[PDB]
Amino acid sequence: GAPATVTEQGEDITSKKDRGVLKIVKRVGNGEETPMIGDKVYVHYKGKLSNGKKFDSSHDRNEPFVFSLGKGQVIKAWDIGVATMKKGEIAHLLIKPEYAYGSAGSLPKIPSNATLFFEIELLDFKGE
Ligand SMILES: COc1cc2cc(c1OC)OC[C@@H](C)Cn1cc(nn1)CCCCOC(=O)[C@@H]1CCCCN1C(=O)[C@H]2C1CCCCC1
Q1: How far is the CA of 11 from the centre of ligand 1 (A)?
Q2: Ligand 1 proximal residues by C-beta, below 6 Å
Q3: How many beta carbons lie within 10 A of that of residue 109, not counting itself?
Q4: Ligand 1: distance of its center to the CA of 55 in Å?
Q5: Which positions are catalytic?
């Protein structure tokens, strides 16, 4: 399914081109602007381990997930990936552990050396 699709077809959006963050745009958004470091960003997301084994969603909290971009509030892969997204866009990200929770993990939700998959919808973003 969707993780394997991202493996096969996703763009590598890392600076180092190490395939640590792979992206597919699933629904095109609008506008020239993408979120800049410091912006307050509003998303809906569905996320899981690539193994399918856990699944977390902003929709289960009946509220958007909000964070300030580049401020260390989220995993590196989100700071990188959401910076590439337009308002209205839905994207798939597949993320190696070096851009998420590494060798330590984040138990009990995230084991060591986990690959993560997310679908993210960019709802809105506002300048600091
Ligand atoms: C490692 O900890 C978690 C990871 C993830 C979700 C977490 C979480 O905490 C327990 O609970 C979400 C919710 C119930 C409470 N919460 C936490 C945060 N905001 N609301 C702040 C969370 C910051 C860390 O999360 C992230 O950086 C990423 C990207 C932003 C959405 C959440 N993220 C996750 O990694 C999820 C994770 C859950 C397991 C399946 C994969 C995704």
Answers
A1: 24
A2: 45, 47-49, 54, 56, 65, 74-75, 78, 106, 109-110, 116
A3: 12
A4: 10
A5: 45, 55-56, 75, 101, 118
Q: For residue 24, what are the contacts with CB-CB under 8 A and spacing of at least 6?
A: 5, 6, 9, 10, 11, 91, 92
Q: Is 117 helix (H, G, I), strand (E, B) or coil?
A: strand
Give alpha helix (H) positions in 34-89: 76-82
Query: Resolution limit in angstroms?
Result: 1.8
Q: Which residue has the tokens 């959006």?
A: 13
- Look at ligand 1, atom 19, and give the residue with the nearest C-alpha: 65
Q: How far apart are CA 39 and CA 66, in angstroms?
A: 10
How big is the chain, counted in residues? 128
Residue with tokens 């909290």: 61
- Helices marked H in the chain: 2-9, 76-82
